[PDB]
Write a protein that binds this ligand. Sequence first.
Ligand SMILES: [Ca+2]
Ligand SMILES: [Ca+2]
Lengths: 88, 88, 90
Amino acid sequence: TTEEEVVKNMKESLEFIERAKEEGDIELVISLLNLLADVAQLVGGEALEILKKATELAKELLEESDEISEKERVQLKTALSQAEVLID
Amino acid sequence: GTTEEEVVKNMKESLEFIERAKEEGDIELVISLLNLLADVAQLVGGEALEILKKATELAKELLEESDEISEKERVQLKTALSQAEVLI
Amino acid sequence: GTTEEEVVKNMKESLEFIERAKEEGDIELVISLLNLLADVAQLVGGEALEILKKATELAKELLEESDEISEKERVQLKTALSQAEVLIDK
Ligand SMILES: [Ca+2]
Ligand SMILES: [Ca+2]
């Protein structure tokens, strides 16, 4: 792989998170936020900027959604913790 | 700072959800939370690893407590357990 | 605690389940196991990285060959592949 191929995949993941927030697809936000954080922890650099954008959207979903279950809340906040520690 | 404290606070809530999950048979949730707690604990250390040790003990029991756990679920849980056990 | 042989054992069984999930079209399992393998391989190196390499080749094959993979499954699988491929090069 190249870094450019990785950031393209991370960008497409970010776009799906943007739409998943409107859709209420909480599970995919949890899964993609965890996957993006696993990638950015190995890549650093621009991968962390994309993770920062994904983290912002997940935070908003966590605050604005009235559909999120208690199980999804605890998973999403744990994934947020991984991201927040990386983007700090 | 406020980051690490919120992190370990979030991890403690997840610990409680893993316990309920282990009793409802929500093995998927146990797998997901154990992997998320390990991803966080790897970056934080300290009290995060104490919390991970406890979640590992909870997940280890569920392994062979009620044969509701499928073969696919078992291999995923064992792989997640391995991640956590190495960090411990 | 755990031993490297116990971890390598679990990693080999995961790879067996991945290859089976590839031919059964179980996309979700491949995504979950590929990510779990990369998480473990990051901490152990050695033969863990060789098992990850095999799992990565199988997941690439699944991405190119399968037909009932959803759009959302695809973007998860590509990102998990990115994680694995970066670790293999680290
Ligand atoms: Ca919806
Ligand atoms: Ca992970």
